[PDB]
């Protein structure tokens, strides 16, 4: 019961760390203060990332 | 135990021990005197 709570969360981690790595490679700032300015239109970041972390 | 049935070595040979400690002195003086001669030879040539 405690194992599954992390197990399904770690499948959710697949997107999250992919959202971490995309953020650095595209933007040198890495912090959350960047994306409000010079925002690029990309579907790769939130879909395979934040939406995958939302599962 | 007090060494039963006679030991092969009594422990101080003196005849053999004296020569082994004697030869070490002979070797020490022979090398330093050649070492002092080498320093004089090196200074004379260069």
């Amino acid at each position: 019961a405690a194992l599954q709570a992390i197990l399904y969360n770690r499948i959710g981690d697949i997107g999250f760390i992919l959202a971490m790595a995309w953020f650095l490679t595209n933007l040198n700032t890495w912090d959350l203060q960047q994306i409000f300015m010079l925002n690029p239109s990309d579907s790769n970041m939130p879909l395979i990332g934040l939406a995958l972390a939302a599962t | 135990k007090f060494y039963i049935q006679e030991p092969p070595h009594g422990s101080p040979n003196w005849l053999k021990v004296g020569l082994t400690l004697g030869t070490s002195v002979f070797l020490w003086i022979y090398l330093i005197k050649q070492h002092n001669e080498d320093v004089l030879e090196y200074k004379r040539r260069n």
Binding site: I6, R10, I11 | -
Partner: protein, 457 residues
Amino acid sequence: KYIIPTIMLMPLTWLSKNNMIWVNSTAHSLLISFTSLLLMNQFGDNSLNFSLLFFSDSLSTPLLILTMWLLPLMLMASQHHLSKENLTRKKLFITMLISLQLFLIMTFTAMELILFYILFEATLVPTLIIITRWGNQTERLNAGLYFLFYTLAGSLPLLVALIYIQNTVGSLNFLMLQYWVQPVHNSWSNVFMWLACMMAFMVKMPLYGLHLWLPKAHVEAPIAGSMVLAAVLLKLGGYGMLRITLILNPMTDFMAYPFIMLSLWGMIMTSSICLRQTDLKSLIAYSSVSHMALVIVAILIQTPWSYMGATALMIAHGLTSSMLFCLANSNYERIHSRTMILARGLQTLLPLMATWWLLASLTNLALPPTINLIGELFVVMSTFSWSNITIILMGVNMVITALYSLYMLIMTQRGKYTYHINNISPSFTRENALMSLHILPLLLLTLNPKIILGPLY
């Protein structure tokens, strides 16, 4: 500064009286380990040479500090073992650790490749004596012979490789002198020259192919569980891949391409087996494959970001897997079997050791920034700049890194042990003191990880 006081530990154990021995070996090692964090840390923009090339300075190697940290730590758990046997047998196998530490200090410090080679293979000889003797279970020889005929089979091609470089391009020596090194023209004659330089650090740094050297050495226990940590020191002891790839062949990365993929599959398949395995020591033996495989991937990318995580992982793994083996040893001297299912019960029988079991297992996972998160995260970020497809495979590995350590927890967090009656005393002072001396350095590296992750940082 480091060699000579380490050599003076050799007459210390032999001259001291029969009742003491262990007190002198542990106390004097701790004061020498203090001076490593006192003098070695000083560096400029480019780290300046120490003295003459007998032992040199550290540029990107604070991994020496880890060897100095395990310098007394290996002597702690080896107290319960060896105690039944003769005093001369004790004095020999304490000095074999000192001889190991003597050669291990020489490997990381000396900025060389020619003299480094005759210290890399020189560490294999003391470990061979330690692994083959004092084995609790049988098949000692099916691990002892395996220890040389894997490493020496891959490392002897360095003699034909390293000498070939210095005969054409000046001399290897300082590495700080090595600006003479010209980029490789990529020829079929130069193909096996690159492979010979790699294969030595493809065995000690375990891949998926030729990886069988590692788990055989860990399962068949050398002495108790603290001599297993010396085999962990040899995984990180193969750090020459940080030096060869950076200097000797910087243009060569086309031949690295299949060897990244060979280590990439040594992540999913190495984690799959480590789920149904019965031996508790084997579960740490296969987890040690994956963590060191992450370093292998990072080195061959050659990006400045990957080295920051690679050097961090060398220190991260060396204090966490060694911590895990001490927990395996703490059950091995009470139950007298490496079986996971038989030895089952924490908190109900082992109250305070269970919290140490938690912190060691949680470090295999990505905890709040200690060193393991810091070490792994740079590699994942570096792989995406290398190729975007990686995290689809690397993310699956992150799922089974939970299963690497939670399966260790679940099969110990059960109120049973009906067949068992032993293990009355949970920890006799030093048993928990071992666990604290492994985790508290990682907790101190939370505040300052700049000292750990430093290849031009």
